[PDB]
Amino acid sequence: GDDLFVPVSNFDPKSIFPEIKHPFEPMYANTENGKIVPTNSWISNLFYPSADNLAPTTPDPYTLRLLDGYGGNPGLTIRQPSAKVLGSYPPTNDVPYTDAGYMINSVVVDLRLTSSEWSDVVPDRQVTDWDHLSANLRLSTPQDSNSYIDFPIVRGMAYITANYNNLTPQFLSQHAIISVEADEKTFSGRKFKITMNDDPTSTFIIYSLGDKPLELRKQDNSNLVASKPYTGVIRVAKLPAPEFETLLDASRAVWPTGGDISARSDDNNGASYTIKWKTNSNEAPLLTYAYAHHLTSIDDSNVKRTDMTLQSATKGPMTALVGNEWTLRETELSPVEWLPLQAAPNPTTINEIMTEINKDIASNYTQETAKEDNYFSGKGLQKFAMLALILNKSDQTQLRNPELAQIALDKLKAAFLPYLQNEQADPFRYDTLYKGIVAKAGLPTSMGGTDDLSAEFGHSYYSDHHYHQGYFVVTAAIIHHLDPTWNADRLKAWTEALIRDVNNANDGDEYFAAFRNWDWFAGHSWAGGIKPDGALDGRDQESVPESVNFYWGAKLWGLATGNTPLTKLASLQLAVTKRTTYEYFWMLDGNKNRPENIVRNKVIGIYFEQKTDYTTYFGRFLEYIHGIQQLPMTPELMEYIRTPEFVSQEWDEKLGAIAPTVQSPWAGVLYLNYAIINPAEAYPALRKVQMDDGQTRSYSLYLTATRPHF
Numbered sequence: 223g224d225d226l227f228v229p230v231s232n233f234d235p236k237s238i239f240p241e242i243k244h245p246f247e248p249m250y251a252n253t254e255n256g257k258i259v260p261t262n263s264w265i266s267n268l269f270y271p272s273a274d275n276l277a278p279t280t281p282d283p284y285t286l287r288l289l290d291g292y293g294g295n296p297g298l299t300i301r302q303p304s305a306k307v308l309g310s311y312p313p314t315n316d317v318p319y320t321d322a323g324y325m326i327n328s329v330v331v332d333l334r335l336t337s338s339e340w341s342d343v344v345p346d347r348q349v350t351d352w353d354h355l356s357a358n359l360r361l362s363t364p365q366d367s368n369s370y371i372d373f374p375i376v377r378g379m380a381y382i383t384a385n386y387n388n389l390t391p392q393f394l395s396q397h398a399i400i401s402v403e404a405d406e407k408t409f410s411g412r413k414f415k416i417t418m419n420d421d422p423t424s425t426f427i428i429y430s431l432g433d434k435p436l437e438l439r440k441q442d443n444s445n446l447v448a449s450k451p452y453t454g455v456i457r458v459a460k461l462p463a464p465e466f467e468t469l470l471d472a473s474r475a476v477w478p479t480g481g482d483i484s485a486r487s488d489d490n491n492g493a494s495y496t497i498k499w500k501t502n503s504n505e506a507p508l509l510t511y512a513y514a515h516h517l518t519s520i521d522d523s524n525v526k527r528t529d530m531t532l533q534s535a536t537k538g539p540m541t542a543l544v545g546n547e548w549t550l551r552e553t554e555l556s557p558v559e560w561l562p563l564q565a566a567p568n569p570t571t572i573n574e575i576m577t578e579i580n581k582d583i584a585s586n587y588t589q590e591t592a593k594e595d596n597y598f599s600g601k602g603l604q605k606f607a608m609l610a611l612i613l614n615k616s617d618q619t620q621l622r623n624p625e626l627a628q629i630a631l632d633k634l635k636a637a638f639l640p641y642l643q644n645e646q647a648d649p650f651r652y653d654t655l656y657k658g659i660v661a662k663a664g665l666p667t668s669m670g671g672t673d674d675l676s677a678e679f680g681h682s683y684y685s686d687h688h689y690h691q692g693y694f695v696v697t698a699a700i701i702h703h704l705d706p707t708w709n710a711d712r713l714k715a716w717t718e719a720l721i722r723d724v725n726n727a728n729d730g731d732e733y734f735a736a737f738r739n740w741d742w743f744a745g746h747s748w749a750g751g752i753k754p755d756g757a758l759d760g761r762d763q764e765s766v767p768e769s770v771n772f773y774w775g776a777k778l779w780g781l782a783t784g785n786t787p788l789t790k791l792a793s794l795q796l797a798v799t800k801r802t803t804y805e806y807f808w809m810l811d812g813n814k815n816r817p818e819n820i821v822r823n824k825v826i827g828i829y830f831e832q833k834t835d836y837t838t839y840f841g842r843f844l845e846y847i848h849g850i851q852q853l854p855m856t857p858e859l860m861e862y863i864r865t866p867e868f869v870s871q872e873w874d875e876k877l878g879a880i881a882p883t884v885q886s887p888w889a890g891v892l893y894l895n896y897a898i899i900n901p902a903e904a905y906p907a908l909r910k911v912q913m914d915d916g917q918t919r920s921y922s923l924y925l926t927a928t929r930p931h932f
């Protein structure tokens with residue numbers, strides 16, 4: 223087919239944006255290797271110190287922590303959460319139908335690999351290599367660097383692999399080790415089945431795969447200690463049930479070291495992506511835990527499903543797959559482009575629409591798009607961009623008015639130009655340390671910043687780039703599609719740099735980190751960037767529709783430029799996005815990935831690697847929580863991402879009971895969502911309710927009047 227991991231461009235962003243070097247540097251990165259540190263990846267906590275060494279790294283189904291200081295010697299700590307704690311906030315009328323408010327994973331030390339040589343010392347640490355799907359973490363004795371353990375940490379791994387080099391294995395737990403079967407016969411051999419007194423019972427199997435066998439001694443209720451330094455690989459795996467023991471034994475010799483991802487489009491309107499797992503050897507089968515969405519989209523013709531499951535941190539049960547390669551297919555790409563699928567409104571609404579569209583174009587674009595920050599500014603531009611788009615495709619929308627179409631396009635251009643030109647209130651800088659673009663606002667005073675990292679929503683520390691830049695890309699592509707010659711060079715360069723910051727698919731584009739905001743294993747985007755202090759719960763994502771908005775923009779930029787691989791790339795990602803959204807974030811009845819009483823919530827809230835919280839970053843009101851999952855409403859969100867089956871379920875459980883009471887512009891959001899399933903009733907209400915600062919009344923009514931069952 224057609225290869226999707228290509229560069230978008232190779233243009234030098236130093237030609238558009240002033241240059242900087244990010245002030246906040248990784249701490250533990252191997253300087254000598256010439257790989258870019260990811261700012262929004264599930265590996266990212268590894269590059270940084272954190273409060274009490276508690277920040278987690280979650281390949282899943284294992285949670286890892288490094289050098290946390292509890293039941294003795296410091297090492298690699300394992301938590302494999304069979305169960306989870308639920309919790310609520312004191313009940314409110316602001317949150318009417320809710321008992322379950324959050325799901326967390328207890329920070330407990332199921333087991334920990336370390337050594338005796340580290341009783342009286344803290345190990346040095348370094349991430350020696352990494353890729354999209356793995357990182358290698360070395361722990362060595364201080365000023366004895368030849369005395370180390372290497373931890374190849376890989377997405378989905380079924381065991382933890384420790385390569386001990388001249389260091390004396392020590393295993394410990396918070397729990398009592400209530401028995402030790404060595405070689406299924408002080409304890410000796412190459413296999414060690416240990417059982418904990420925790421609940422559910424944890425069983426691990428330790429395997430030594432070096433030259434010599436291990437000899438271990440119970441030093442305390444939770445310490446097994448080797449008899450002399452070991453050199454060679456140890457592995458430990460959780461035994462999920464008695465019947466998978468042969469399974470873990472057979473695959474003990476083979477461990478993952480990383481992985482290669484490619485992706486192609488398939489002539490019959492589909493695309494796919496392949497993870498080629500990298501391993502130490504092919505001498506036994508590769509066991510790899512998969513997420514739910516993996517199961518529903520993998521090409522079975524090359525894996526074997528097992529029944530061996532373990533819970534992940536926040537995604538539901540994981541199921542182990544046997545096989546070296548995974549090809550994940552998305553066969554139903556979005557057909558959405560610029561307009562809704564039914565492009566022309568119910569005609570008896572056209573007069574109303576035009577009237578409204580004329581009041582809206584009379585708005586002051588500068589004052590509605592030159593806001594305190596980039597985020598709300600971008601909201602403003604995309605909203606008017608929509609108006610310029612429907613007037614200038616009157617061919618399809620049947621909204622003819624040459625003179626207003628021209629105005630709607632000109633006023634947009636004049637609004638958008640200061641951004642094109644990087645003269646907005648919070649301009650960008652090209653960052654040469656992490657290879658992306660950052661807003662100036664949150665940088666130090668000594669670089670023109672406010673010295674406040676939380677400024678512009680964390681964007682200076684790489685939070686929210688898909689959210690913020692999605693707005694500018696949709697606006698850029700809309701402009702470029704309606705006027706391909708207006709500032710064409712500068713427009714391409716700039717727009718493509720923003721795209722590249724978020725979603726560079728190819729690292730021969732060496733100006734930008736690859737897939738800054740996108741995670742090929744989880745099948746979704748991460749919002750949360752660098753957190754100086756530590757990301758105690760890993761990556762977070764709030765808004766799904768601001769992620770969707772970005773890839774929509776990217777697709778639109780593909781259409782606007784005739785860029786096929788880009789257009790398909792963006793489509794594949796919107797498919798995988800759809801699939802993960804329904805698996806983990808917008809819960810249809812029948813969802814196995816969450817407790818019954820979180821599913822009743824209908825939306826996950828703020829999603830993290832180690833928790834879920836039913837709340838927002840900006841107020842605990844029902845309509846905020848659900849509202850953020852409903853803007854920007856665009857043809858992508860409307861036609862393709864938010865299904866009628868989901869809108870209906872969400873309406874009936876929570877929202878139809880509070881929406882007629884809401885007086886803030888949150889009404890406007892809500893009833894535009896409601897139009898998805900009942901535009902007859904939504905329309906009258908959108909005639910009168912308030913608009914979110916990124917919604918217009920004309921577009922709200924036009925969209926509503928295009929629902930084909932109006």
Ligand SMILES: OC[C@H]1O[C@@H](O[C@@H]2[C@@H](O)[C@H](O[C@@H]3[C@@H](O)[C@H](O[C@@H]4[C@@H](O)[C@H](O[C@@H]5[C@@H](O)[C@H](O)O[C@H](CO)[C@H]5O)O[C@H](CO)[C@H]4O)O[C@H](CO)[C@H]3O)O[C@H](CO)[C@H]2O)[C@H](O)[C@@H](O)[C@@H]1O
Nearest residue numbers: 597679680685686689749750751762764765768839840841
């Ligand atoms: O209408 C009532 C109030 O509405 C506000 O406008 C809304 C606006 O808040 C909302 O923002 C969304 C962001 O949450 C999201 O950005 C995330 C960050 O918020 C979050 O940073 C948190 C920080 O908020 C918290 O207080 O401290 C944390 C400590 O680390 C910090 O992490 O981090 C996330 C990355 O990890 C980041 O994604 O994303 C978007 C903007 O960046 C928004 O979608 O958006 C709503 C929809 O437009 C707004 O309505 C008003 O400003 C208030 O004045 C009103 O009272």
Ligand SMILES: OC[C@H]1O[C@@H](O[C@@H]2[C@@H](O)[C@H](O[C@@H]3[C@@H](O)[C@H](O[C@@H]4[C@@H](O)[C@H](O)O[C@H](CO)[C@H]4O)O[C@H](CO)[C@H]3O)O[C@H](CO)[C@H]2O)[C@H](O)[C@@H](O)[C@@H]1O
Nearest residue numbers: 756757758759760828830834835837838839840841842843
């Ligand atoms: O309205 C008055 C003032 O309220 C502020 O808005 C709050 C908002 O700050 C709050 O956000 C919370 C976060 O505080 C919290 O972040 C956690 C970190 O602080 C902690 O150290 O790390 C963990 C992860 O390890 C983070 O959870 O996280 C929760 C989600 O778990 C966020 O909701 O939420 C409030 C209710 O929605 C909201 O009212 C605002 O920022 C002030 O300026 C404002 O004046």
Ligand SMILES: OC[C@H]1O[C@@H](O[C@@H]2[C@@H](O)[C@H](O[C@@H]3[C@@H](O)[C@H](O)O[C@H](CO)[C@H]3O)O[C@H](CO)[C@H]2O)[C@H](O)[C@@H](O)[C@@H]1O
Nearest residue numbers: 311324325329758759833834835836837838839841842
């Ligand atoms: O939005 C509701 C409410 O949220 C509050 O945020 C808290 C966080 O403080 C908390 O973060 C945890 C730490 O307190 C703890 O020590 O470490 C763990 C990791 O092991 C952290 O997750 O998370 C809870 C539950 O999700 C949140 O309620 C805000 O302070 C408050 O303003 C807001 O109203």
